[PDB]
Design a protein around this ligand. Structure first.
Ligand SMILES: CONS(=O)(=O)c1ccccc1
Lengths: 1719, 263
């Protein structure tokens, strides 16, 4: 709304805070009266009578509670009054509640009931609590209250197994305390700062219940924190439509009905108000208001008043006296007792002869404290926060035992200990407020609590509370304590800061969001009901009835303030708010907005300590601090001595603040009372203010100031300067020895090279030489070393190895130690790279490898530095100079192949009508790259390399070579490899069409199953495979003729040799080269690639001559690419994504307003959030549905097919999204809508970037990192993924260009410019992945000695690159002897590992041979470490379920980065499965399948994306099982092998051994099983032997469903068996036992296995196993594939003459129930 | 005459605080570095000082107490008459406004073994038309004790604090200057025998086209001006490859941080 006004917020503030009194009059209970005395007035208010148990409100017995909740009232008989009235609302409903009652009336027990209701929601059927399904937040105003609540709640709920805890001020390591806690107890501010920070799968989604205790803090200057929490919670709730219950606990004060509106309490269901007659003990009140103004006379008046009241209670009642300074406790108790002595009244307290005297006298002798000494024997005591714990417990136990007579204390007692007293006196209501910089009145919460301690719940018949204050405050305290001080909103002051926090979170993105947010504030409710109180005329209100305009004005004002201070960029015309990094820091560090403006203005890279202290001292948190005349001499004394000079005078506050901080760090004692409290305030703030400064200068890269400010953070925390002995940080080390060490100036570092003796001698104290030596080596210390790996001449990869070099001890290191790794330039001025490093206790002895990139230039600079500095320990750092004097840089890369300007090639150039029919409907001409390479591809047999950007049509280039192959050889075999299975599937579709359909050849896609893949290879002309599927096949090329007789080998996306799965691709390409050299009929190779800077090395490795090497660079893409890389300078991920949301929309409207757009986002969740946010933005553009290009009615039939409603809404507005969690049908529907132009925008998760069948005009890549849950860290997108994403901006048949915007963190921008605008350098990583391949080559006898292994390596890409970029591979030169030494070293390492693993043997240290274990690993394509683990764990009596556990723990299984919240679901799966599993550990990627296998097996559940997960796991399971079989079979054991075979069956059919076979049949269930048991049939054959009518009747099934049953029954194995023992008589002891077994199928079936729950299509496998179960002995075994009839031999030795009866087993790997036994 | 009417109390206002405040502003001068070119004829060697280490040298210095670094370098591959200064070495030292006190031991480190010593650089508070007699004496005594310091190749660069700037000037000794300086025992400002012909100006250029580096002591820092008692002409030291701390850094004045701790 247009005519906004700018308001003065300061003129709307209630300056008195909680002392503001909105009521004009105070009415007093009947029988009150006012007495006059010299210089003061007394007001007396009598005790109230309890309401006399009207309404027959009986006390509810714990019996009639719900049984789950009775345990929470163990040891109670009934409820008390208030809980009985609150029971139904609290325990039997989820209504939000507000309870008003006098403090001490029971409100906390009602909160207990709400907690019990919540806990009840999470009962298992075993009675336990799923403690991981929920969090409860209990917000309490005071820290001492937090602690007491953690204790009492924890004891009440321990029977439930529930953990209650508080949160530490340290959260960057201790956020596991949130994960461990079900009931979090904290202050408003703590929960505010925690929820201000938006993270990744944080636990705020578990919050179901929030209790706001003492919610009348709303009236305090702290109250706005509660408003922020409630507005944030309610808006989050509506955002996510998950309910969260809110409970408010309040004193009884006016406006409670407005508090209930604020909490969304229904006044008829959840509002309960109990007046002060419900106090547990009636209260006679005395108020004493002094009229004297002269301080001197006023203080003695007060002391005479307290003495007279004391005297009224001496010897009849204990008195608790509350004062407001720890020192005042002693001074006041002393004034009173001195007056008693001088007046001779001390005998009234301490009677002579009474037993209480006798009890006191003991510690009246002992006396631990000094003031306690002077006062304890007289009957007086003090209590406060400078005293010990056991002194305080002394005071508490003594007072509670009715021994102390006069206890002087402070508010902390009132909040933190449950110690009441008959008489309470509040001695003055003035308290010194450092933050206000002056004396003010005590807060109301404090007053209420202290007077709530008057009267003890069972001893006293009444309490007597006496409040002494100044006369002008009488009406305030009278109002507060008699239900009449109204609760108001203090929010107007804090509005800019609160608004920024919501902008930073993304909850408020424009002024209308902000008006909506303000509508949930307590302020808004109060503005509506009392407008004039808040600066609004009654006629202003009538002209603006929902205060829309006034809220707009307040929001506008605050936003302008935030914009002036650079926290926010505020667009006045649109109302939009743009987050900034400085705004984020202000919110996340809880800093006021003026302060971060000061910091932004004054922080410079050149600042020294002097100016850094000055900057801190100008923070606005300190703006009320003044320099008082009386403080000026002492301050001057400190100034002239401070170690950091102060430039300004002691007239200015900032100099006092500076000096106070420095005095704190030096641990100086000050004398002035004001100076000490001011120091406390300043230094309590300093930690988080200085960490904010640290984060600012670190992220700007300011090396020296980053160092100075991290040091200052640590000096504030440790309370010492750098110069002090770092050993002071071990609190246990006695100060004297440390001072002795310091006196000697020698370096602490010297201590490392000494021992017990020399250490004792150097400081000349031998008695300590040992423990010093201990502490020296507990001091955190890290050794560093680097491997420099040049990428180009201007980019260097660094692998940093961190080695811990100290002894860990949980007593000083906790469970982790954090460090900053800072990579700094030549001058130590710029931080080129940095990152956080966490050393966990469990890895404390392990080396850690970190890898990062830095820029370099020529001429090379002298050196960089790597500093690793502790985040917490002072003088704990290691710096490694990284010299470049010996860095070997790779050769500058060559120019690209020139793109010749040729006549576009018509399709007719194929000179073949059948061939031409594949393209002539698609286009008339081939593109420039196809035209350039065509002659070489199509008219020569030369090996070809084509390097070009994704989207350049390289696939057609390979088709040219295939068509040449088809003209040379009628049964030519082309094998085609691509690295990604999704690509393989797409190529399969397209080429099945081109070459099978219109050309009548055979196209096949390898599946991964050996024998069927061999059949595909034999009959296919085009064979499509991913790399591992061709690796396992081509390993056996010496015995597979179809592998050698390959005409054409095409490898696509060959630049991925440099990425994560590159080694296997390198290996198979190298093998194809080696074969082609061994068979003298060369295999033509064609390699396709993204543009490569070192293309010539790939070409040369693959045998491509330089005229056949086409090495094009990115600017040749046939559809020109307009690439824009846009940097975002925000280091926190969720906030950075927020800052990207609007630019996404603006990029669409600028670069592609009408043409299709793909937005890639980092996560599944973000796809939906960004689709919604785009829609929101185009609605606020008054351009809703601009992305919808078909009509809604044409879209509805589509929309019905989906299960996601949100997806339906967004799709209705022209925006789709794609993420892993969508059913394949849904994904296809969205892709169809996108490609048919019906919807214009699709948002896709990054993980789909390889398997999308859509393309766009514009691709937006929104951020370039994703969260890895395995390692709990953000990972950069591989450059390969980014190139593949950019490639989707390519529509040759439709666009004149493609456009792409990459939005990335600013510190990534340079990297992308280097590796997207230029061709890509790739390296090998085969040297990190050698063992399985060496092992395979030893099995097939390609490697028979160490020389063979070196020769083998010479065929690799690794070998070529070693001469081109030696330092990358850790060579230090390229000489042939360097090469030979390096290769020999690598060979010796690999073969030694394989030998230790028992995969191979090594004889005469030269010759290698395969061991049967190596042969198994190679045959089944299993990692050698996996098979070693198998060889270990397996034995002759491992249980089946143990097998499941073994197999789950195998290198093969590392696939889960999503779910930790299903760890509890698996915990309960452990009970559902009969697996008596051992070691109930949890949460591993391998520990999923430990029982997620069984989740598949029982058919237990189909669930979520885990479905996809299961499909990969099952993929590897059979092989792993078969390996175990093989292991057992070789050992000689008969039983566990058969167990493994039946487990193969189990996995295939998804059943178990004890379960019923009938579970195999389609459309079956348990009821059918018990019916077939009732008839007496238990076999598949049984079902086959039935009459068709009776068959159809027994099953109660549909016709088509029994047709499914019939197809299964007609492929079920029914094999006739026969055996013959060759020469059964003529069998001599020692000779051969040739047993023969002939098997004949009954109908030679030709389908694969019927196994719907198993993913891959399987062929049927069999084992003919002759053994004797007499002793777990297997004697002969053969695997077989049976087609129709098979004849199988088995050989065996006959040791000695004797009993000769053997058992022949026929075991399937696929079906359960066909396992035979003959003799 | 007021014994009692007017009493006043002295309050320490110590010297080094003001100088620390001043030293914090030194970075401003690194934008205004001038080299005097009043020499002529271009005959001797030409010295090229990389700006990065010179700026750092200025930033770690003091307005009133001189500091010194040792110069190490080489000639470009094909110009033997050009000396490129590649490294400055900071060693334990203290200074006055008129001279610096260095150990007798020269830098020894393997990492320097491929360079030649080129002399030394020092700051001084004010420009001067002449090379001071203290500099001549210091250079001549170094050469007398270290034959690796060639009189035709080792220079003194002076870094003078001019208005808002620094002015650099480079000199070398002559034979007669060596002979007078090596026997000169008069540390004052006007010792007998001192002559303008005991030195001559040499050509120096600043460069941004390469970068120098620093070496500093391995276990101490270089600045002993706050603990001269711990400094000794005969002290020995090893070196490390790292950048020097500024003059008033806490590690240079630890007694200020332990003594304040006594109130
Ligand atoms: C303060 O808001 N943050 S929260 O308490 O964790 C919350 C999460 C979800 C719904 C409601 C509240």
């Amino acid at each position: 709304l247009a005519p906004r006004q700018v308001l003065d917020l300061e003129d709307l503030v209630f300056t008195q805070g909680s002392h503001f009194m909105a009521n004009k009059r105070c009415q007093l209970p009947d029988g009150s009266f006012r007495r006059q005395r010299k210089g003061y007035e007394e007001v007396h208010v009598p005790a109230l009578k309890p309401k006399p148990f009207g309404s027959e409100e009986q006390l509810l017995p714990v019996e009639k509670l719900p049984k789950y909740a009775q345990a929470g009232f163990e040891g109670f008989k009934t409820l008390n009054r208030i809980q009985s009235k609150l029971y139904r609302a609290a325990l039997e409903t989820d209504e939000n509640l507000l309870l008003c009652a006098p403090t001490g009336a029971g409100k906390t027990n009602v909160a207990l009931m709400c907690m019990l209701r919540e806990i009840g929601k999470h009962i298992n059927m075993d009675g336990t609590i799923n403690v991981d399904d929920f969090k409860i937040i209990y917000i309490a105003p005071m820290r001492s209250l937090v602690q007491e609540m953690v204790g009492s709640f924890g004891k009440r709920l321990a029977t439930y197994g529930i953990t209650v805890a508080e949160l530490t001020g340290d959260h960057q390591l201790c956020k596991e305390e949130i994960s461990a806690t079900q009931i979090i107890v904290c202050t408003p501010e703590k929960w505010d700062i925690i929820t201000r920070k938006g993270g990744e799968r944080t636990y705020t989604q578990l919050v179901r219940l929030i209790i706001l205790d003492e919610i009348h803090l709303l009236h305090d200057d702290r109250g706005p924190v509660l408003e922020a929490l409630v507005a944030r919670a309610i808006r989050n709730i509506e955002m996510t439509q998950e309910d969260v219950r809110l409970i408010g606990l309040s004193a009884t004060l006016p406006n409670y009905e407005d508090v209930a509106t604020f909490l969304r309490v229904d006044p008829a269901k959840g509002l309960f108000y109990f007046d002060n007659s419900f106090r547990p003990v009636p209260l006679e009140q005395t108020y004493v208001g002094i009229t004297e103004k002269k301080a001197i006379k006023r203080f003695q008046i007060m002391n005479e008043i307290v003495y007279e009241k004391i005297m009224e209670h001496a010897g009849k009642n204990q008195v608790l006296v509350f004062v407001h300074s720890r020192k005042e406790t002693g001074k006041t108790a002393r004034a009173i007792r001195d007056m008693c002595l001088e007046k001779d009244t001390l005998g009234l307290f301490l009677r002579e002869g009474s037993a209480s005297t006798e009890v006191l006298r003991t510690e009246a002798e002992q006396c631990k404290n000094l003031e306690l000494k002077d006062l304890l024997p007289y009957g007086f005591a003090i209590h406060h926060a400078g005293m010990t714990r056991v002194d305080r417990t002394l005071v508490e136990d003594l007072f509670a035992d009715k021994h102390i007579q006069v206890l002087v204390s402070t508010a902390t007692l009132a909040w933190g200990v449950n110690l009441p007293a008959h008489t309470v006196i509040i001695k003055g209501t003035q308290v010194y407020s450092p933050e206000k910089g002056r004396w003010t009145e005590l807060g109301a919460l404090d007053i209420l609590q202290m007077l709530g301690r008057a009267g003890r719940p069972q001893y006293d018949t009444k309490g007597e509370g006496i409040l002494i204050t100044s006369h002008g405050e009488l009406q305030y305290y009278l109002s507060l304590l008699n239900q009449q001080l109204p609760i108001e909103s203090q929010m107007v002051s804090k509005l800019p800061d609160m608004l920024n926090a919501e902008i930073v979170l993304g909850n408020v993105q424009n002024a209308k969001d902000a008006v909506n947010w303000l509508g949930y504030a307590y302020l808004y409710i109060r503005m509506l009901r009392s407008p004039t109180l808040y600066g609004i005329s009654h006629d202003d209100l009538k002209g603006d009835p929902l205060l829309d305009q006034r809220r707009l004005d307040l929001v506008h004002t605050a936003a302008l303030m935030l914009d002036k201070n650079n926290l926010v960029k505020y667009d006045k015309k649109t109302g939009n708010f743009q987050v900034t990094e400085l705004g984020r820091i202000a919110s996340h560090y809880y800093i006021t907005n003026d302060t971060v403006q000061t910091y932004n203005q004054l922080l410079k890279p050149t600042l020294s300590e002097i100016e850094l202290f000055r900057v801190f001292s100008l923070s606005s948190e300190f703006k009320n601090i003044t320099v008082r005349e009386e403080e000026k001499l002492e301050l001057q004394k400190l100034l002239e001595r401070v170690p950091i000079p102060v430039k300004e005078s002691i007239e200015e506050p900032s100099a006092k603040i500076n000096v106070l901080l420095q005095a704190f760090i030096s641990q100086l004692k000050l004398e002035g009372f004001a100076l000490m409290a001011d120091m406390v305030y300043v230094t309590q703030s300093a930690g988080r203010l200085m960490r904010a400064i640290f984060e600012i200068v670190l992220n700007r890269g300011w090396a020296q100031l980053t160092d100075k400010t991290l040091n200052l953070c640590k000096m504030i925390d440790k309370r010492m300067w750098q110069s002090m002995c770092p050993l002071r940080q071990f609190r246990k080390l006695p100060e004297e020895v440390v001072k002795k060490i310091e006196k000697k100036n020698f370096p602490f570092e010297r201590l490392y090279d000494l021992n017990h003796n020399e250490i004792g001698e150097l400081i000349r104290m031998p008695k300590m030489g040992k423990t010093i030596h201990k502490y020296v080596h507990l001091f955190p210390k890290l050794e560093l070393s680097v491997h420099l790996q040049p990428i180009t001449r201007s980019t260097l990869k660094v692998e940093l190895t961190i080695t811990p070099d100290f002894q860990w001890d949980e007593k000083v290191h906790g469970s982790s130690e954090a460090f900053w790794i800072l990579v700094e330039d030549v001058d130590s001025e710029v931080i080129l790279h940095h990152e956080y490093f966490l050393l966990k206790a469990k890895y404390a002895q392990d080396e850690h490898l970190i890898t990062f990139f830095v820029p370099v230039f020529e001429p090379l600079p002298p050196q960089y530095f790597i500093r690793v500095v502790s985040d917490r320990w002072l003088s704990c750092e290691t710096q490694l100079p990284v010299s470049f004097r010996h860095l070997i840089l790779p050769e500058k890369y060559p120019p690209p192949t020139e793109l010749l300007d040729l006549q576009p090639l018509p399709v007719s150039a194929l000179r073949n009508s059948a061939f031409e029919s594949l393209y002539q409907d698609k286009f008339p001409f081939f593109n420039p790259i196809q035209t350039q390479v065509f002659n070489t591809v199509y008219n020569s047999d030369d090996n070809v390399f084509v390097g070009a950007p994704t989207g350049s049509g390289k696939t057609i280039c390979a088709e040219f070579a295939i068509l040449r192959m088809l003209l040379q050889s009628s049964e030519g075999r082309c094998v085609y490899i691509t690295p990604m299975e999704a690509l393989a599937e797409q190529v399969y579709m397209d080429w099945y069409e081109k070459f099978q359909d219109r050309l009548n050849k055979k196209v096949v896609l390898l599946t991964g199953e050996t024998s069927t893949d061999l059949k595909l290879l034999g009959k296919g002309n085009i064979i499509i495979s991913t790399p591992e599927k061709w690796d396992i096949l081509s390993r056996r090329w010496k015995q597979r003729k179809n592998v050698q007789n390959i005409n054409l080998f095409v490898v696509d996306e060959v630049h991925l040799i440099g990425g994560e799965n590159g080694p296997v691709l390198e290996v198979i390409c190298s093998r194809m080269r080696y074969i082609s050299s061994q068979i003298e009929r060369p295999i033509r190779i064609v390699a396709l690639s993204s543009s490569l800077s070192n293309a010539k090395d790939v070409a040369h490795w693959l045998g491509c001559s330089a005229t056949s090497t086409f090495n094009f660079h990115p600017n040749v893409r046939p559809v020109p690419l307009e690439l824009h890389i846009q940097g975002f300078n925000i280091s926190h991920t969720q906030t950075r994504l927020l800052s990207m949301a609007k630019p996404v929309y603006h990029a669409i409207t600028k670069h592609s307003p009408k043409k299709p757009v793909i937005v890639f986002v980092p996560s599944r969740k973000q796809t939906r959030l960004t689709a919604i946010d785009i829609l929101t933005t185009c609605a606020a553009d008054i351009q809703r549905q601009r992305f919808l290009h078909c009509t809604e009615k044409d879209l509805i039939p589509y929309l019905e097919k989906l299960s996601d409603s949100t997806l339906k809404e967004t799709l209705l507005n022209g925006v789709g999204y794609l993420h892993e969690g969508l059913s394949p049908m849904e994904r296809r529907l969205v892709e169809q809508l996108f490609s048919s132009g019906a919807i214009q925008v699709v948002v896709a998760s990054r993980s789909l970037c390889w398997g999308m069948n859509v393309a766009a005009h514009l691709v937006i890549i929104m951020d370039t990192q994703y969260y890895n849950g395995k390692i709990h860290a953000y990972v950069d997108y591989p450059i390969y993924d980014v190139l593949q994403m950019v490639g989707h901006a390519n529509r040759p048949l439709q666009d004149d260009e493609g456009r792409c915007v990459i939005m990335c963190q600013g510190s990534k921008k340079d990297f992308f410019k280097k590796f997207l605008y230029e061709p890509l350098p790739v390296e090998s990583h085969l040297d990190h992945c050698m063992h399985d391949h060496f092992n395979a080559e030893i099995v097939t006898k390609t490697i028979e000695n160490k020389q063979d292994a070196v020769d083998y390596l010479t065929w690799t890409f690794l070998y070529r690159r070693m001469t081109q970029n030696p330092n990358y591979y850790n060579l230090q030169g390229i000489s042939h002897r360097h090469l030979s030494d390096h290769l020999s070293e690598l060979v010796e390492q690999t073969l030694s590992d394989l030998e230790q693993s028992k995969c191979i043997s090594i004889e005469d240290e030269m010759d290698v041979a395969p061991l049967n274990l190596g042969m198994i690993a190679a045959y089944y394509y299993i990692n050698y470490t996996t098979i070693e683990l198998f060889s270990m764990s397996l034995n002759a009596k491992t249980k089946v379920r143990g097998l499941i556990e073994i197999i789950s723990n195998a290198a093969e299984y590392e696939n889960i980065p999503i779910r930790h919240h299903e760890d509890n679901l698996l915990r309960q799966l452990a009970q559902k499965v009969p697996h008596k599993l051992n070691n109930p550990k949890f949460n591993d990627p391998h520990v999923k399948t430990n029982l997620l296998l069984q989740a598949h097996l029982s058919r237990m559940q189909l669930s979520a994306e885990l479905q996809s997960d299961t499909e990969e796991i099952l993929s590897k399971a059979i092989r792993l099982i078969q390996a175990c079989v093989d292991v057992l079979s070789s050992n000689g054991w008969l039983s566990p092998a058969l167990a493994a075979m039946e487990l193969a069956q189990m996995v295939t059919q998804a059943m178990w051994s004890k379960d019923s076979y009938l579970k195999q049949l389609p459309h079956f269930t348990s009821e059918h099983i018990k019916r077939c048991t009732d008839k007496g049939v238990e076999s598949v054959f049984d079902i086959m032997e039935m009459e068709d009518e009776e068959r159809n009747a027994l099953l109660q099934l549909t016709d088509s469903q029994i047709a499914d049953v019939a197809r299964f029954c007609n492929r079920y194995p029914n094999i006739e068996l026969s055996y013959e023992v060759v020469d059964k008589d003529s069998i001599r002891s020692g000779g051969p036992v040739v047993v023969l077994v002939q098997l004949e199928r009954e109908e030679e079936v030709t389908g694969p296995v019927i196994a719907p729950l198993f993913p891959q299509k399987r062929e049927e496998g069999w084992w003919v196993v002759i053994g004797d179960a007499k002793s777990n002995s297997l004697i002969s075994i053969k695997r077989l594939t049976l087609q129709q009839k098979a004849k199988v031999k088995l050989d065996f030795v006959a040791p000695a003459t004797g009993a000769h009866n053997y058992t022949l087993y026929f075991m399937s790997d696929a079906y359960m129930g066909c396992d035979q036994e003959y003799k | 005459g007021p014994l009692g009417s007017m009493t006043q109390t002295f309050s320490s206002k110590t010297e080094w605080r003001v100088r620390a405040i001043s030293a914090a502003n030194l970075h401003l001068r690194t934008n205004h570095i001038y080299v005097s070119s009043d020499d002529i004829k271009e005959t001797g060697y030409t010295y090229i000082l990389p700006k990065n280490v010179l700026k750092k040298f200025i930033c770690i210095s003091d307005l009133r107490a001189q500091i010194a670094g040792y110069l190490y370098g080489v000639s470009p591959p094909d110009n033997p008459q050009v000396k490129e200064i590649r490294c400055i070495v900071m060693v334990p030292q203290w200074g006055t406004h008129q001279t610096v006190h260095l150990p007798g031991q020269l830098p020894q480190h393997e990492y320097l073994k491929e360079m030649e010593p080129l002399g030394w650089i020092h700051t001084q508070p004010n420009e001067s038309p002449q090379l001071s007699p203290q500099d001549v004496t210091t250079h001549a005594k170094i050469m007398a004790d270290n034959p690796s310091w060639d009189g035709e190749k080792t220079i003194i660069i002076t870094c003078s604090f001019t208005p808002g700037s620094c002015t650099l000037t480079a000199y070398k000794l002559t034979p007669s200057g060596y002979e007078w300086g090596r026997q000169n025992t008069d540390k004052g400002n006007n010792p007998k025998g001192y002559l303008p012909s005991h030195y001559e100006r040499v050509q120096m250029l600043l460069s941004d086209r390469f970068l120098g580096f620093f070496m500093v002591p391995a276990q101490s820092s270089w600045n002993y001006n706050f603990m001269g008692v711990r400094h000794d002409p005969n002290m020995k030291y090893e070196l490390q490859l790292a950048n020097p701390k500024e003059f008033y850094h806490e590690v240079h004045r630890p007694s200020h941080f332990l003594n304040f701790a006594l109130l």
